[PDB]
Amino acid sequence: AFCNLRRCELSCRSLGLLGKCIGEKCKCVPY
């Protein structure tokens, strides 16, 4: 579970979204 929540949020900034750790990895949450 190499989740990096600060990097996850900063990746979703490029789409304008929020970022969450899904269990093992990061995903952006739909707006």
From Swiss-Prot:
Any other comment in the entry? Answer: Negative results: does not show inhibition on KCa3.1/KCNN4 at concentrations up to 50 nM.
Lineage, top-rank taxon, reads Eukaryota
Q: Which cysteines in this chain are paired by disulphide bridges?
A: C3-C21, C8-C26, C12-C28
Result of altering R13A: 1.45-fold decrease in cell death of Jurkat cells
Where expressed (tissues)?
A: Expressed by the venom gland.
The record's comment on protein family reads: Belongs to the short scorpion toxin superfamily. Potassium channel inhibitor family. Alpha-KTx 05 subfamily.
Task: Using the UniProt annotation, give all residue ranges assigned to the region ([R/K]XCQ motif).
Answer: 6-9
Main subcellular location: secreted
UniProt xrefs under InterPro entries: Scorpion_toxin-like_sf, Scorpion_toxinS_K_inh
Classification via SUPFAM superfamilies? Scorpion toxin-like
Task of the protein: Blocks small conductance calcium-activated potassium channels. Shows activity on KCa2.2/KCNN2 (IC(50)=0.0243 nM), KCa2.3/KCNN3 (IC(50)=1.7 nM), and KCa2.1/KCNN1 (IC(50)=42 nM). Induces cell death when tested on human T lymphoblastic leukemia Jurkat E6.1 and human breast cancer MDA-MB-231 cell lines which constituvely express KCa2.2/KCNN2, but not on human peripheral blood lymphocytes (which do not express KCa2.2/KCNN2).
What lineage does UniProt assign to this protein's organism?
Eukaryota, Metazoa, Ecdysozoa, Arthropoda, Chelicerata
Quote the subcellular location field of this record.
Answer: Secreted
Q: What is this protein called?
A: Potassium channel toxin alpha-KTx 5.4
Q: Which organism is it from?
A: Hottentotta tamulus (Eastern Indian scorpion)
